[PDB]
Amino acid sequence: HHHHHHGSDLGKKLLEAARAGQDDEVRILMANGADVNAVDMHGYTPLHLAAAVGHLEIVEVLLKAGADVNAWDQVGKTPLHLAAKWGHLEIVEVLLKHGADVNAQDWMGRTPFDLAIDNGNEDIAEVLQKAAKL
Amino acid sequence: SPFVNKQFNYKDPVNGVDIAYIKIPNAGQMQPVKAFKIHNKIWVIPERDTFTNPEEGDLNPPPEAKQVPVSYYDSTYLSTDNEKDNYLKGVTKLFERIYSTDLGRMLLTSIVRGIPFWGGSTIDTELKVIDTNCINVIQPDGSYRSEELNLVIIGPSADIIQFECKSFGHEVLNLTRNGYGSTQYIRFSPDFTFGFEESLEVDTNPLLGAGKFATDPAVTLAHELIHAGHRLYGIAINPNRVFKVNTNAYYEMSGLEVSFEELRTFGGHDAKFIDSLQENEFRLYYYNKFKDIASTLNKAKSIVGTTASLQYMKNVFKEKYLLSEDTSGKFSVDKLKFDKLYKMLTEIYTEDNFVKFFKVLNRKTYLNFDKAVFKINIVPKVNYTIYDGFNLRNTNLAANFNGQNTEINNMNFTKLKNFT
Ligand SMILES: [Zn+2]
């Protein structure tokens, strides 16, 4: 009746689309059944990439589709770790708003607060600082 | 003048310099393991690799029915101290044998000089080290000192003979294929070797041959060290660029496809399966990648995370990528200088050229079928020597590669599994 066959793996196309900020491509691939929690060879999820590159609307559309806000890569970083590193206040706020673990630690022991202050992101460090002391 | 100055013993105490407890980038919260700095920017973790992959945390094999014929599983290997000592001295002796040839001497010098590029910063104009290109070295206080390194020799994972070269990725960068480079982790054991046949007809047949000869482990490690030389200079080919094998009916039957990367590493006739159009695009593609690194270095205004000067850290990377510096001090890529450097890591550092200089018997192609797996002990000098390997000089083992013959030298090769 409406049977389509997937010629290529949709995970990789969803991860590539989220990395380059093609919101329509993400939204279209999500409509045809791409897995929002797929992984690349390094443990990165579509939310990891959409958060590290700074796309607010991509981060939200995925989180709506059930993306794990606390998934970690092969070195222990979460989407919150990446978004604080690259100075994305709005992405960091959205992730926190959905209950991301502000105390996640990577292989070196660093939290998203440490990554924020280690990359010159003061206003994004005071938010993580406060959210931890809440 | 040895490449590895110390005669390390696993039992040796940790001094915190070249013998220390370290933490590798890992998905878990791993307990520190003992590692030995055998050379500048080269470390040896004589442990089974349960840390690099988040799904291979244990050494349990897959169901007896899902096991592929070409594999060997043994959860107890490299678990006791004595094997950790023997493993460490075996890996050390294998570096000495590689280094005792001008070809391997150049390879090892290109690896130690191939510093992973400092493209970690989030600010356009400052240079910074990528965290996953370092390791966490334990201090006396219990504090952790971060330290840079280029190569790491680690034990095998669940599949003991799954030798490979792997690095950790970046969220926004393609370190292995953008020129930058990344610290390489090699799964390797000097206690195992693959069996093959001298007769090419038998070697290319899945159903014949029982491993008449044994691969020299220095060539196997030299094969993975060439993968490192590619990934450390960031010029590796995407692993999904495969060749539809048409020269081996048995491959064609199963629809197998070998990646251009491994064909390039083997060299000889194998590297010619890549057509001139494919080789030309990569050389030009990575010639431009070095220009982006030369452009990043020219726009460098600051350096963070070290006591070294900005000018000094640019110099490290002018010597790595062989960039040209003009009177004003601006870095450029000289197409001919690059072509010499590019051909060196792709056509000169090959498994084939290494077999020519070791003067050992080896597989004559990468498109063959492994016949068996043997257990070897290369540490005793009556078994295996730096300069001759198994084919010891002045003995009956020198002529006709007899030292590599698993029945004529039947005491140095213990068969564990028959793939044939
Ligand atoms: Zn290989």
Numbering used by the authors:
A (entry chain C): 7 to 140
B (entry chain A): 1 to 420
Q: What did the publication describing this PDB structure actually write?
A:
Botulinum neurotoxins (BoNTs) produced by anaerobic bacteria of the genus Clostridium are the most poisonous bacterial protein toxins known. BoNTs are produced as single precursors that share a common domain organization. They are processed into mature toxins by cleavage into a ~50 kDa light chain (LC) and a ~100 kDa heavy chain (HC) that remain connected through an interchain disulfide bond. The LC is a zinc-dependent endopeptidase that specifically cleaves members of the soluble N-ethylmaleimide-sensitive-factor attachment receptor (SNARE) family of proteins, which are key components of the vesicular fusion machinery within presynaptic nerve terminals. DARPins are small, engineered antibody mimetics derived from synthetic libraries of consensus ankyrin proteins that are very specific and show very high affinity to the target protein.
We identify DARPin-F5 that completely blocks SNAP25 substrate cleavage by BoNT/A1 in vitro. The crystal structure contains two toxin/DARPin complexes per asymmetric unit (rmsd value of 0.2 Å for 510 Cα atoms of both AC and BD complexes). The crystal structure of the complex reveals that DARPin-F5 binds to a substrate-binding site between the α- and β-exosites of LC/A1, far away from the active site of the catalytic domain. The DARPin therefore inhibits SNAP25 hydrolysis by preventing substrate binding. The most prominent feature seen in the complex structure is a network of interactions involving Glu-171 of LC/A1 and three residues from different loops of the DARPin. These interactions include a salt bridge that is formed between Glu-171 of LC/A1 and Lys-91 of the DARPin, respectively. In addition, Arg-25, and the phenolic hydroxy group of Tyr-50 of DARPin-F5 form hydrogen bonds with the backbone oxygen and the carbonyl group of Glu-171, respectively. Moreover, two additional residues from LC/A1, Lys-128 and Asp-131, are also involved in the complex formation with DARPin-F5. Like Glu-171, these residues are not interacting with the substrate nor the belt, indicating that the binding of the substrate and possibly also belt is prevented through steric hindrance by the DARPin. In addition, the 8xHis tag present in the DARPin (chains C and D) also interacts with the LC/A1 (chains B and A, respectively) of the other complex.
